[PDB]
mmCIF file of all heavy atoms in Angstrom:
data_model
loop_
_atom_site.group_PDB
_atom_site.id
_atom_site.type_symbol
_atom_site.label_atom_id
_atom_site.label_comp_id
_atom_site.label_asym_id
_atom_site.label_seq_id
_atom_site.Cartn_x
_atom_site.Cartn_y
_atom_site.Cartn_z
ATOM 1 N N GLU A 284 0.789 -1.225 -0.018
ATOM 2 C CA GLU A 284 0.003 -0.023 0.036
ATOM 3 C C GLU A 284 0.818 1.300 0.022
ATOM 4 O O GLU A 284 0.310 2.330 -0.445
ATOM 5 C CB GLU A 284 -1.083 -0.030 1.049
ATOM 6 C CG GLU A 284 -1.932 -1.172 1.104
ATOM 7 C CD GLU A 284 -2.895 -1.339 -0.084
ATOM 8 O OE1 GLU A 284 -3.070 -0.531 -0.935
ATOM 9 O OE2 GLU A 284 -3.546 -2.484 -0.147
ATOM 10 N N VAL A 285 2.051 1.199 0.483
ATOM 11 C CA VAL A 285 3.011 2.351 0.459
ATOM 12 C C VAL A 285 3.367 2.606 -1.021
ATOM 13 O O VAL A 285 3.454 3.713 -1.401
ATOM 14 C CB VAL A 285 4.141 2.220 1.462
ATOM 15 C CG1 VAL A 285 5.157 3.268 1.330
ATOM 16 C CG2 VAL A 285 3.648 2.319 2.866
ATOM 17 N N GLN A 286 3.606 1.489 -1.716
ATOM 18 C CA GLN A 286 4.121 1.540 -3.113
ATOM 19 C C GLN A 286 2.960 2.035 -3.937
ATOM 20 O O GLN A 286 3.127 2.580 -5.009
ATOM 21 C CB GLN A 286 4.602 0.109 -3.550
ATOM 22 C CG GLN A 286 5.872 -0.453 -2.845
ATOM 23 C CD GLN A 286 7.196 0.087 -3.423
ATOM 24 O OE1 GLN A 286 7.448 1.200 -3.679
ATOM 25 N NE2 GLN A 286 8.177 -0.931 -3.556
ATOM 26 N N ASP A 287 1.649 1.746 -3.473
ATOM 27 C CA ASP A 287 0.444 2.077 -4.301
ATOM 28 C C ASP A 287 0.182 3.622 -4.092
ATOM 29 O O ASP A 287 -0.288 4.248 -5.041
ATOM 30 C CB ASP A 287 -0.759 1.318 -3.785
ATOM 31 C CG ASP A 287 -0.797 0.102 -4.679
ATOM 32 O OD1 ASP A 287 -0.166 -0.283 -5.506
ATOM 33 O OD2 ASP A 287 -2.102 -0.475 -4.468
ATOM 34 N N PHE A 288 0.343 4.054 -2.787
ATOM 35 C CA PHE A 288 0.031 5.488 -2.525
ATOM 36 C C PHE A 288 1.146 6.416 -2.329
ATOM 37 O O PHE A 288 1.003 7.463 -1.747
ATOM 38 C CB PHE A 288 -0.991 5.502 -1.390
ATOM 39 C CG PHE A 288 -2.314 5.034 -1.702
ATOM 40 C CD1 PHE A 288 -3.141 4.344 -0.674
ATOM 41 C CD2 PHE A 288 -3.067 5.288 -2.968
ATOM 42 C CE1 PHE A 288 -4.457 3.874 -1.057
ATOM 43 C CE2 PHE A 288 -4.363 4.903 -3.249
ATOM 44 C CZ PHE A 288 -5.081 4.222 -2.202
ATOM 45 N N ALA A 289 2.348 6.157 -2.995
ATOM 46 C CA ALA A 289 3.522 6.964 -2.838
ATOM 47 C C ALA A 289 3.475 8.265 -3.743
ATOM 48 O O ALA A 289 3.836 9.289 -3.238
ATOM 49 C CB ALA A 289 4.604 6.137 -3.403
ATOM 50 N N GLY A 290 2.773 8.265 -4.837
ATOM 51 C CA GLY A 290 2.719 9.474 -5.724
ATOM 52 C C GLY A 290 1.595 10.300 -5.089
ATOM 53 O O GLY A 290 1.636 11.564 -5.359
ATOM 54 N N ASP A 291 0.615 9.675 -4.469
ATOM 55 C CA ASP A 291 -0.534 10.299 -3.896
ATOM 56 C C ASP A 291 -0.076 11.201 -2.659
ATOM 57 O O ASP A 291 -0.718 12.270 -2.441
ATOM 58 C CB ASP A 291 -1.554 9.307 -3.453
ATOM 59 C CG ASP A 291 -2.891 9.684 -3.339
ATOM 60 O OD1 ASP A 291 -3.329 10.504 -2.408
ATOM 61 O OD2 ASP A 291 -3.737 9.252 -4.194
ATOM 62 N N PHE A 292 1.024 10.715 -2.057
ATOM 63 C CA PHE A 292 1.621 11.311 -0.849
ATOM 64 C C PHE A 292 2.830 12.244 -1.237
ATOM 65 O O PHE A 292 3.452 12.747 -0.318
ATOM 66 C CB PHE A 292 1.977 10.236 0.221
ATOM 67 C CG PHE A 292 0.908 9.964 1.123
ATOM 68 C CD1 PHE A 292 -0.270 9.272 0.749
ATOM 69 C CD2 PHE A 292 0.911 10.362 2.479
ATOM 70 C CE1 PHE A 292 -1.401 8.888 1.592
ATOM 71 C CE2 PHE A 292 -0.065 9.958 3.415
ATOM 72 C CZ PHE A 292 -1.189 9.273 3.013
ATOM 73 N N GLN A 293 3.073 12.243 -2.500
ATOM 74 C CA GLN A 293 4.301 13.080 -2.994
ATOM 75 C C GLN A 293 5.596 12.606 -2.486
ATOM 76 O O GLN A 293 6.491 13.441 -2.296
ATOM 77 C CB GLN A 293 4.093 14.500 -2.777
ATOM 78 C CG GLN A 293 2.868 15.165 -3.379
ATOM 79 C CD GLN A 293 2.429 16.499 -2.501
ATOM 80 O OE1 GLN A 293 2.616 17.552 -2.991
ATOM 81 N NE2 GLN A 293 1.723 16.185 -1.329
ATOM 82 N N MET A 294 5.851 11.202 -2.344
ATOM 83 C CA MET A 294 7.120 10.647 -1.909
ATOM 84 C C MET A 294 8.158 10.550 -2.909
ATOM 85 O O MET A 294 7.900 9.995 -3.984
ATOM 86 C CB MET A 294 6.736 9.260 -1.255
ATOM 87 C CG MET A 294 7.141 9.115 0.193
ATOM 88 S SD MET A 294 5.916 10.004 1.258
ATOM 89 C CE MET A 294 5.175 8.566 1.924
ATOM 90 N N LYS A 295 9.350 10.900 -2.545
ATOM 91 C CA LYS A 295 10.547 10.792 -3.457
ATOM 92 C C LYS A 295 11.440 9.661 -3.081
ATOM 93 O O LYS A 295 11.834 9.405 -1.961
ATOM 94 C CB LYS A 295 11.293 12.173 -3.284
ATOM 95 C CG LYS A 295 12.306 12.460 -4.347
ATOM 96 C CD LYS A 295 11.890 12.997 -5.678
ATOM 97 C CE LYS A 295 12.923 13.237 -6.854
ATOM 98 N NZ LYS A 295 12.263 13.871 -8.001
ATOM 99 N N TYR A 296 11.692 8.702 -4.049
ATOM 100 C CA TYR A 296 12.413 7.512 -3.846
ATOM 101 C C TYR A 296 13.931 7.839 -4.040
ATOM 102 O O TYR A 296 14.420 8.675 -4.711
ATOM 103 C CB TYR A 296 12.026 6.530 -5.003
ATOM 104 C CG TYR A 296 10.679 5.887 -4.869
ATOM 105 C CD1 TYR A 296 9.585 6.293 -5.536
ATOM 106 C CD2 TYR A 296 10.594 4.767 -3.985
ATOM 107 C CE1 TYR A 296 8.317 5.747 -5.383
ATOM 108 C CE2 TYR A 296 9.380 4.122 -3.823
ATOM 109 C CZ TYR A 296 8.179 4.522 -4.455
ATOM 110 O OH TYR A 296 6.992 3.943 -4.376
ATOM 111 N N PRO A 297 14.843 7.260 -3.083
ATOM 112 C CA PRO A 297 14.583 6.280 -2.074
ATOM 113 C C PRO A 297 14.257 6.824 -0.755
ATOM 114 O O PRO A 297 14.662 8.007 -0.458
ATOM 115 C CB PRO A 297 15.890 5.409 -2.096
ATOM 116 C CG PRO A 297 16.953 6.464 -2.357
ATOM 117 C CD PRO A 297 16.226 7.317 -3.427
ATOM 118 N N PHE A 298 13.476 6.086 0.071
ATOM 119 C CA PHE A 298 13.044 6.516 1.290
ATOM 120 C C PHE A 298 12.967 5.337 2.286
ATOM 121 O O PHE A 298 12.805 4.142 1.951
ATOM 122 C CB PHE A 298 11.794 7.356 1.467
ATOM 123 C CG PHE A 298 10.499 6.683 0.905
ATOM 124 C CD1 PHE A 298 9.730 6.036 1.716
ATOM 125 C CD2 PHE A 298 10.226 6.717 -0.444
ATOM 126 C CE1 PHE A 298 8.401 5.384 1.372
ATOM 127 C CE2 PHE A 298 8.962 6.083 -0.924
ATOM 128 C CZ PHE A 298 8.101 5.449 0.019
ATOM 129 N N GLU A 299 13.017 5.646 3.619
ATOM 130 C CA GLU A 299 12.865 4.550 4.634
ATOM 131 C C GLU A 299 11.965 4.899 5.770
ATOM 132 O O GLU A 299 11.915 6.043 6.283
ATOM 133 C CB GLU A 299 14.229 4.353 5.403
ATOM 134 C CG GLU A 299 15.339 3.637 4.608
ATOM 135 C CD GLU A 299 16.460 3.272 5.484
ATOM 136 O OE1 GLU A 299 17.019 4.162 6.216
ATOM 137 O OE2 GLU A 299 16.743 2.094 5.633
ATOM 138 N N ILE A 300 11.099 3.894 6.108
ATOM 139 C CA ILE A 300 10.141 3.999 7.102
ATOM 140 C C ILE A 300 10.598 3.207 8.353
ATOM 141 O O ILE A 300 11.149 2.179 8.021
ATOM 142 C CB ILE A 300 8.693 3.610 6.700
ATOM 143 C CG1 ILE A 300 8.250 4.499 5.558
ATOM 144 C CG2 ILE A 300 7.719 3.668 7.759
ATOM 145 C CD1 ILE A 300 6.906 4.127 4.986
ATOM 146 N N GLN A 301 10.496 3.794 9.529
ATOM 147 C CA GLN A 301 10.884 3.057 10.732
ATOM 148 C C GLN A 301 9.689 2.950 11.687
ATOM 149 O O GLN A 301 8.858 3.826 11.684
ATOM 150 C CB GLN A 301 12.046 3.732 11.368
ATOM 151 C CG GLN A 301 13.343 3.587 10.743
ATOM 152 C CD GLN A 301 14.484 4.486 11.180
ATOM 153 O OE1 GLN A 301 14.523 5.622 10.861
ATOM 154 N NE2 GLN A 301 15.291 3.961 12.015
ATOM 155 N N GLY A 302 9.722 1.915 12.578
ATOM 156 C CA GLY A 302 8.665 1.646 13.550
ATOM 157 C C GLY A 302 8.953 0.856 14.626
ATOM 158 O O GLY A 302 9.368 -0.205 14.455
ATOM 159 N N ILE A 303 8.727 1.423 15.854
ATOM 160 C CA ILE A 303 8.931 0.756 17.197
ATOM 161 C C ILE A 303 7.579 0.649 17.864
ATOM 162 O O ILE A 303 6.848 1.565 17.793
ATOM 163 C CB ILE A 303 10.065 1.472 17.923
ATOM 164 C CG1 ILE A 303 10.317 0.772 19.372
ATOM 165 C CG2 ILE A 303 9.607 2.958 18.157
ATOM 166 C CD1 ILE A 303 11.505 1.364 20.089
ATOM 167 N N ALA A 304 7.310 -0.606 18.297
ATOM 168 C CA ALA A 304 6.113 -0.845 19.041
ATOM 169 C C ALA A 304 6.172 -1.820 20.145
ATOM 170 O O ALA A 304 6.652 -2.947 19.931
ATOM 171 C CB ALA A 304 4.983 -1.261 18.066
ATOM 172 N N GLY A 305 5.590 -1.593 21.312
ATOM 173 C CA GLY A 305 5.683 -2.557 22.409
ATOM 174 C C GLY A 305 5.101 -1.971 23.688
ATOM 175 O O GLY A 305 4.190 -0.957 23.504
ATOM 176 N N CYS A 306 5.349 -2.566 24.841
ATOM 177 C CA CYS A 306 4.884 -2.127 26.018
ATOM 178 C C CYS A 306 5.863 -2.232 27.151
ATOM 179 O O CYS A 306 6.964 -2.846 26.911
ATOM 180 C CB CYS A 306 3.699 -3.069 26.492
ATOM 181 S SG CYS A 306 3.904 -4.832 26.304
ATOM 182 N N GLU A 307 5.623 -1.585 28.352
ATOM 183 C CA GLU A 307 6.511 -1.692 29.469
ATOM 184 C C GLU A 307 5.906 -1.635 30.879
ATOM 185 O O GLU A 307 4.892 -1.083 31.077
ATOM 186 C CB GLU A 307 7.601 -0.521 29.448
ATOM 187 C CG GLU A 307 7.116 0.931 29.340
ATOM 188 C CD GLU A 307 8.135 1.886 29.481
ATOM 189 O OE1 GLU A 307 9.206 1.623 30.166
ATOM 190 O OE2 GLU A 307 8.065 3.032 28.941
ATOM 191 N N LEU A 308 6.566 -2.338 31.769
ATOM 192 C CA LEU A 308 6.156 -2.486 33.143
ATOM 193 C C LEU A 308 6.692 -1.426 33.956
ATOM 194 O O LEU A 308 7.899 -1.017 33.867
ATOM 195 C CB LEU A 308 6.594 -3.845 33.850
ATOM 196 C CG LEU A 308 5.598 -4.774 34.567
ATOM 197 C CD1 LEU A 308 6.480 -5.879 35.167
ATOM 198 C CD2 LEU A 308 4.654 -4.165 35.481
ATOM 199 N N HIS A 309 5.907 -0.694 34.889
ATOM 200 C CA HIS A 309 6.204 0.274 35.728
ATOM 201 C C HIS A 309 6.164 -0.249 37.139
ATOM 202 O O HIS A 309 5.434 -1.299 37.414
ATOM 203 C CB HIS A 309 5.329 1.497 35.683
ATOM 204 C CG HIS A 309 5.598 2.151 34.424
ATOM 205 N ND1 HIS A 309 6.877 2.442 33.919
ATOM 206 C CD2 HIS A 309 4.640 2.823 33.605
ATOM 207 C CE1 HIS A 309 6.790 3.204 32.737
ATOM 208 N NE2 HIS A 309 5.509 3.332 32.552
ATOM 209 N N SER A 310 6.839 0.433 38.149
ATOM 210 C CA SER A 310 6.700 -0.033 39.483
ATOM 211 C C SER A 310 5.323 0.366 40.003
ATOM 212 O O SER A 310 4.739 1.429 39.782
ATOM 213 C CB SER A 310 7.781 0.657 40.393
ATOM 214 O OG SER A 310 7.769 2.058 40.209
ATOM 215 N N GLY A 311 4.711 -0.626 40.593
ATOM 216 C CA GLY A 311 3.264 -0.500 41.037
ATOM 217 C C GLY A 311 2.291 -1.328 40.298
ATOM 218 O O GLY A 311 1.176 -1.586 40.701
ATOM 219 N N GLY A 312 2.746 -2.049 39.154
ATOM 220 C CA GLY A 312 1.963 -2.883 38.337
ATOM 221 C C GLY A 312 1.492 -2.479 36.999
ATOM 222 O O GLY A 312 1.129 -3.313 36.152
ATOM 223 N N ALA A 313 1.420 -1.103 36.749
ATOM 224 C CA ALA A 313 0.838 -0.582 35.550
ATOM 225 C C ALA A 313 1.694 -0.811 34.290
ATOM 226 O O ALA A 313 3.012 -0.791 34.360
ATOM 227 C CB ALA A 313 0.644 0.849 35.726
ATOM 228 N N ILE A 314 1.128 -1.238 33.112
ATOM 229 C CA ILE A 314 1.842 -1.356 31.904
ATOM 230 C C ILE A 314 1.384 -0.414 30.735
ATOM 231 O O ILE A 314 0.256 -0.486 30.261
ATOM 232 C CB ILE A 314 1.594 -2.883 31.300
ATOM 233 C CG1 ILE A 314 2.387 -3.813 32.266
ATOM 234 C CG2 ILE A 314 1.847 -3.110 29.821
ATOM 235 C CD1 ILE A 314 2.364 -5.279 31.883
ATOM 236 N N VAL A 315 2.247 0.491 30.319
ATOM 237 C CA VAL A 315 1.900 1.405 29.365
ATOM 238 C C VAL A 315 2.509 0.967 28.089
ATOM 239 O O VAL A 315 3.553 0.432 27.907
ATOM 240 C CB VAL A 315 2.505 2.899 29.579
ATOM 241 C CG1 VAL A 315 1.828 3.400 30.920
ATOM 242 C CG2 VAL A 315 3.938 2.926 29.694
ATOM 243 N N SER A 316 1.602 0.996 26.942
ATOM 244 C CA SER A 316 2.013 0.621 25.628
ATOM 245 C C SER A 316 2.304 1.756 24.723
ATOM 246 O O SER A 316 1.710 2.882 24.935
ATOM 247 C CB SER A 316 0.902 -0.284 25.088
ATOM 248 O OG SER A 316 0.760 -1.434 25.855
ATOM 249 N N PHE A 317 3.102 1.613 23.676
ATOM 250 C CA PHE A 317 3.430 2.647 22.732
ATOM 251 C C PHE A 317 3.521 2.054 21.386
ATOM 252 O O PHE A 317 3.547 0.835 21.068
ATOM 253 C CB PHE A 317 4.747 3.230 23.234
ATOM 254 C CG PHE A 317 5.889 2.202 23.455
ATOM 255 C CD1 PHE A 317 6.812 1.967 22.372
ATOM 256 C CD2 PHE A 317 5.979 1.577 24.693
ATOM 257 C CE1 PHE A 317 7.920 1.036 22.508
ATOM 258 C CE2 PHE A 317 7.128 0.588 24.769
ATOM 259 C CZ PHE A 317 8.037 0.401 23.779
ATOM 260 N N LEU A 318 3.655 3.019 20.357
ATOM 261 C CA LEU A 318 3.790 2.748 18.943
ATOM 262 C C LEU A 318 4.153 4.118 18.321
ATOM 263 O O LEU A 318 3.466 5.071 18.394
ATOM 264 C CB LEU A 318 2.501 2.160 18.243
ATOM 265 C CG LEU A 318 2.701 1.615 16.786
ATOM 266 C CD1 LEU A 318 1.697 0.571 16.647
ATOM 267 C CD2 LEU A 318 2.572 2.697 15.743
ATOM 268 N N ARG A 319 5.408 4.085 17.711
ATOM 269 C CA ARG A 319 5.924 5.338 17.138
ATOM 270 C C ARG A 319 6.241 4.949 15.796
ATOM 271 O O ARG A 319 6.836 3.902 15.515
ATOM 272 C CB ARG A 319 6.970 5.995 17.931
ATOM 273 C CG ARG A 319 6.806 6.232 19.457
ATOM 274 C CD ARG A 319 7.835 7.026 20.127
ATOM 275 N NE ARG A 319 9.062 6.301 20.108
ATOM 276 C CZ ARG A 319 9.313 5.440 21.160
ATOM 277 N NH1 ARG A 319 8.393 5.129 22.085
ATOM 278 N NH2 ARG A 319 10.647 4.777 21.253
ATOM 279 N N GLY A 320 6.021 5.911 14.754
ATOM 280 C CA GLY A 320 6.325 5.696 13.469
ATOM 281 C C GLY A 320 7.272 6.684 12.868
ATOM 282 O O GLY A 320 7.343 7.843 13.467
#
């Protein structure tokens, strides 16, 4: 879908997309989740 909508988004080749996603434990028991692109 990125190859399909590249011109639509005005993207110049070559480019790189990065992404980190997961969760973490805090003291007390709470678990916060994240996702960054």
Side-chain angles (χ1 to χ4, degrees):
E284 307 294 353
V285 170
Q286 297 274 44
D287 266 12
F288 290 143
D291 207 285
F292 272 70
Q293 303 153 103
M294 241 79 105
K295 197 79 178 181
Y296 288 96
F298 63 94
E299 288 194 302
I300 299 180
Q301 286 172 275
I303 179 170
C306 51
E307 59 171 325
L308 234 189
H309 289 320
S310 53
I314 286 182
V315 301
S316 297
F317 55 95
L318 191 153
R319 300 188 298 276

